[PDB]
Structure 1
């Protein structure tokens, strides 16, 4: 593939997010690195405008699937890396069951040798006392399967999956994700056969950090073929 060679080593990552949820404007910056050979990501995020108005876990999916590990026999299906370095646009609507929804738009591409994910997020119709604005979510994260299928007319892919966020009372808050990725360049991209990415993430805190933040370690590997 084209961009495949761009991910052979450890690649630095820079994340920029501007958000507005129910009238509360905020920004998050993140830095770290990704090692696609092992499907590994290590990143630290900071809310640069003060306290984050929504729970950090709700932003995980939004805050670079080109770092997923694709087994050798599945390389022909790696759309994400095939779109580099010009990049792809990734859009989503995230529906929080019995609550609001996030609508996001991001561009992920290389700037020099840094992989950048620049995102705009708008959150609407959230209940002021629901699990999100009420900060009722536990600070942890579950493993999920992310389903990918080709969208040939759009020369891109459609992705869909459900995230299960543990709530403090033992219950669960579901977040249905609908995603569309399209290439930024005019060049060719690899359009995949159906498959999924198996994801696991662990959230932690930097004991020395006084700003509102989240440390994230994540492993993602492709499967299903």
Structure 2
């Protein structure tokens, strides 16, 4: 509720990612706004180092679940906002089926009035001609359910989910996600019962933008209780 009060209005968001995938180094910067009352995020990301060496859709999940709309009856299950303003560390491993993996570490916290997501991504064991390094994925929305459970031993949560990315030939590239979040501060946080976040992300382009970029409109809602 201390943390939850920080999200009653529209909050500006900043995202900064430093990445290395099979030795291809890159940086992405993002800005936008989130409105947790509606579970709504609007963001624009730019590759600041030039051309992105992987498909934008593969970075969506990595590039602020504190903006999830938790129904009133599930408010005692919102770990993410309860960690604020000091924040949380989000770590993932993302296994691309028949290809490489991403490992990510992010810190999500407030800097003044701004919610900041600072990320390091490391990708290894990708195939030069695979769907990822070969840029064979469609620039398509992604939607799925993030399954959350408590992790008492680290005073945090774990999550797992699958994203099925459409491939240009009509097939699918599976990305299996394994997630862990832990608070940065030492204050109390809400450890939830099992539930999920229903998440939909729509991907678009800015017609006047010449840099490599992605525009995102996302809706995230807690459910399953």
TM-score band (shorter)?
over 0.9
3-state secondary structure, aligned to 1:61: coil
- SS of 2:75 mapped into structure 1: helix
Distance, in Å, in 1 between the alignment partners of 2:4 and 2:169 is 44
Q: How far apart in 2 are the matches of 1:86 and 1:24?
A: 32
The equivalent of 1:23 in structure 2 is 23
Alignment partners' CA distance in 2, 1:154 and 1:170: 41
Under a length normalisation based on structure 2, what TM-score does the superposition of the two structures give?
0.99
Q: Deviations over 1:50-98 (max 9, x none)?
A: 0000000000000000000000000000000000000000000000000
- Distance in 2 (CA, whole Å) between partners of 1:56 and 1:153 is 34
Cα distance, 1:142 vs structure 2 = 2.7
Q: CA deviation at 1:10?
A: 0.2
Distance 1:107 1:199 in 2: 21
- In structure 1, stretches of 5+ residues that fail to align are none
| Alpha-carbon distance in structure 1 between the residues aligned to 2:18 and 2:95 | 19
- What is the rounded CA distance, in whole Å, between the counterparts of 1:141 and 1:159 in structure 2? 21
CA distance in 2, matches of 1:37, 1:141: 22
Q: Give the Cα–Cα distance (whole angstroms) in 2 for the partners of residues 154 and 118 of structure 1.
A: 21
1:153 offset after TM fit, Å? 1.1
Show the counterpart of 1:222: 222
State the match for 1:158 in structure 2. 158
Distance in 2 (CA, whole Å) between partners of 1:194 and 1:23 is: 38
Moved segments of 4+, more than 2 Å? none
**Pairwise CA distance, 1:147:** 0.2
Q: Which moved more, 1:213-222 or 1:140-149?
A: 140-149
